[PDB]
């Protein structure tokens with residue numbers, strides 16, 4: 045069958061955690077890039093120095109979106125690992141200044157229990173704004189927004205969170 049997970053953080057990939065948030069309409073919180081038009085994605089982070097995923101995610105979320113009214117409804121039993129192209133990799137190495145093939149992250153489903161006013165793409169006054177906009181999309185739509193190298197990594201999250209969406 046499908047093979048796009050990881051029951052353990054492999055080598056080359058840096059610690060990371062994803063936060064899959066959904067709306068009362070059963071949509072998935074998708075945010076557009078602040079540098080790439082039409083580039084949508086979900087809030088994620090490379091975990092904190094010696095931080096547990098579930099925490100880094102719940103934390104990272106309030107850092108990337110600042111969403112305070114959100115609770116976990118699901119958690120992918122495995123880790124999601126992806127890779128970047130020779131332009132992104134080669135670019136990150138200089139822009140980000142890191143030498144990694146990708147990032148293994150354990151996506152966690154979060155049910156929004158607040159108001160659209162809580163959604164702050166900037167962050168909780170910690171990190172700098174990464175997204176410029178956001179919208180609600182179905183697990184199939186968000187999949188259409190995601191990129192080829194991030195399709196499975198996402199579909200996995202949704203797939204695992206299907207019963208919740």
Ligand SMILES: Nc1ncnc2c1ncn2[C@@H]1O[C@H](COP(=O)(O)OP(=O)(O)OP(=O)(O)O)[C@@H](O)[C@H]1O
Pocket residue numbers: 060083084085088089090128132147189190191194
């Ligand atoms: N949909 C996309 N289309 C084109 N390039 C993309 C897309 N999504 C990501 N990228 C490229 O990949 C880079 C990083 O990929 P990704 O968004 O998966 O990682 P990340 O958000 O940097 O990870 P993190 O912030 O957790 O450390 C982007 O800066 C961009 O160059």
